[PDB]
Design a protein around this ligand. Structure first.
Ligand SMILES: CCCCCCCCCCCCCC(=O)O
Ligand SMILES: Fc1cc2nc[nH]c2cc1Cl
Length: 130
């Protein structure tokens, strides 16, 4: 849809703080902090795939909107994830150990804007088409 494409990270604010609030240790925060991943989003019927590719790590999720799935995150959390579409925004929630974080992906002009929230910390990442 609006989301399908190959996207490259162009900007990020507060991602270290976000990773810290998730419990990510220093070595992994250091690897994530200056990573400039690509995000490849595709759809085949009911099934949406999001690949995230960077020099040191590749991850992938495939899902159906509104159906919970098990996910291993890039920082090795084992989470239960659910993704829905709300007003054109893809809203992902991850739940583990009684905690939750939300990742919202939205299309704005030329950009794919991703907002990640954990407790009082909000991170914003912007991608542009590769
Ligand atoms: C190898 C570096 C891994 C860094 C671990 C980061 C923690 C996972 C949070 C990912 C939030 C997704 C944001 C996005 O799609 O831009
Ligand atoms: F959040 C991330 C997720 C990733 N998955 C693969 N490489 C990545 C780099 C970053 Cl920073």
């Amino acid at each position: 849809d609006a989301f399908v494409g190959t996207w490259k990270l162009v900007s990020s604010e507060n991602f270290d703080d976000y990773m810290k609030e998730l419990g990510v240790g220093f070595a992994t925060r250091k690897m994530g902090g200056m990573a400039k991943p690509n995000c490849i989003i595709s759809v085949n019927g009911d099934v949406i795939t999001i690949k995230t590719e960077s020099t040191l790590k590749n991850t992938e999720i495939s899902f159906i909107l509104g159906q919970e799935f098990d996910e291993v995150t890039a920082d090795d959390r084992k989470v239960k994830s659910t993704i829905t579409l709300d007003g054109g925004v893809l809203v992902q929630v991850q739940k583990w150990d009684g905690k939750s974080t939300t990742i919202k992906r939205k299309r704005e002009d030329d950009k794919l804007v991703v907002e990640c929230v954990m407790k009082g910390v909000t991170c914003t990442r912007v991608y542009e088409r590769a």
